[PDB]
């Protein structure tokens, strides 16, 4: 649908965004506490959901999705506010 | 390369945006799955040209690639796939449709 969290949990969250099976090569998720140990991970293009996990309950966290295309280019898929 | 449609000329302050599901220019000779693309304030005043997904100067942009002066419009029912069958305009062998939008579609202030 859009880039937004589906299932939310005190230790992890499920994020989702509109699939693409012609243009993306992999997605790259990136996430850390707000302002202030950055973390990221990588998902293949065919997928369109991802499981961020092992978070600190109650703590605010800026998430972001990023995409690398077939033309070896880099772009971010929107940007989302997340704070407990 | 030429935008199949004509421009939305901005005459104010807030830039071009569209509530979700609004923004696709009307085109009766096009299928529901082809209803998708982007407005790019292109290269005075700002003017936003419509280009379909996978066509135009930014034809390698995924849908949702956050750039500047590009916005993504898609109608409920469209597919996330390229418009090779539609392509763009060639201003010699055709002229530009006047970009119309259905009824009820909202437009920012200073857009007509």
Curated annotation (Swiss-Prot), chain B:
Changing residue 47 to E: Complete loss of RNA-binding. Coiled coil: none annotated. ADP-ribosylated. The ADP-ribosylation is retained in the virion during infection. Residues 1-112 are annotated as: RNA-binding. Changing residue 91 to S: In strain: Omicron/BA.4. It is found in: Virion; Host cytoplasm; Secreted; Host extracellular space. RNA binds at residues 47, 89. Changing residue 32 to R: In strain: Gamma/P.1. Residues 1-112 form the CoV N NTD domain. Belongs to the betacoronavirus nucleocapsid protein family. Packages the positive strand viral genome RNA into a helical ribonucleocapsid (RNP) and plays a fundamental role during virion assembly through its interactions with the viral genome and membrane protein M. Plays an important role in enhancing the efficiency of subgenomic viral RNA transcription as well as viral replication. Attenuates the stress granules formation by reducing host G3BP1 access to host mRNAs under stress conditions. This is Nucleoprotein. The chain holds residues 49 to 172 of 419 of the full protein.
